[PDB]
Amino acid sequence: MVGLTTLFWLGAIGMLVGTLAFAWAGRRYYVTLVGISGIAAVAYVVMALGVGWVPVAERTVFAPRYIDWILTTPLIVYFLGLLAGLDSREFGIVITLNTVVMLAGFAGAMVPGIERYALFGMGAVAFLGLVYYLVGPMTESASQRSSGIKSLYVRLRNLTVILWAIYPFIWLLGPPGVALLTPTVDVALIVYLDLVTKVGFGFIALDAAATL
Numbered sequence: 001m002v003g004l005t006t007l008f009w010l011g012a013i014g015m016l017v018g019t020l021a022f023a024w025a026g027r028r029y030y031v032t033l034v035g036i037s038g039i040a041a042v043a044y045v046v047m048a049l050g051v052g053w054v055p056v057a058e059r060t061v062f063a064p065r066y067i068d069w070i071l072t073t074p075l076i077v078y079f080l081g082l083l084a085g086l087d088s089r090e091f092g093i094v095i096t097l098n099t100v101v102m103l104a105g106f107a108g109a110m111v112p113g114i115e116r117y118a119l120f121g122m123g124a125v126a127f128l129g130l131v132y133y134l135v136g137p138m139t140e141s142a143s144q145r146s147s148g149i150k151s152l153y154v155r156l157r158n159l160t161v162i163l164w165a166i167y168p169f170i171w172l173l174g175p176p177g178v179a180l181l182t183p184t185v186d187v188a189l190i191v192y193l194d195l196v197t198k199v200g201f202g203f204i205a206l207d208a209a210a211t212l
Ligand SMILES: CCCCCCCC/C=C/CCCCCCCCOC(=O)[C@H](O)CO
Pocket: 054, 063, 067, 070, 071, 072, 074, 075, 095, 099
């Protein structure tokens, strides 16, 4: 009743609507949000059209998903870094930590043997370091800003930390890991998370930009 392609089209539409909404409201932050959801829109369309479905051993890996993540997640971290007022050196640490997470996940998905769990573990370790920087140094830094900016940062940070922490569990329980969850359920869960961590993220920012 509900196929993989239908789910991909749903993600595509959701990202498209977010993209147009952000572009209009911007008639730096607004341009970043267009990139976050705009890139994801393209990845989902490609996947909806059946492009980039790589067979690996016994499972199917969706390559556009990881290219999406590698480009859009640093933009989310960048957005949060601007809110917190990071110096260009602090940016380098967190964006480097982020890229290690994304690359490790991409590589582990593409490896058929058990070495893929070794790649997954390395992404997990780097993710814990990324969480430390969001909850600590970047929160210290955001404190120096107005009360409204600091409030916005804390809200987006909380959304980001809680939801991003769920992805490694979905990956591990799905086809890439112990292939418990079926591809359809696993995809459905990730489409939901992608939409909330990108389009939901964006709309919470828009809401605060009008409350000024
Ligand atoms: C715009 C954000 C600016 C911040 C970004 C910071 C650094 C981003 C890191 C980029 C390196 C990503 C390499 C892409 C992998 C391409 C393999 C593609 O190969 C393939 O096609 C698959 O193997 C197919 O199965």
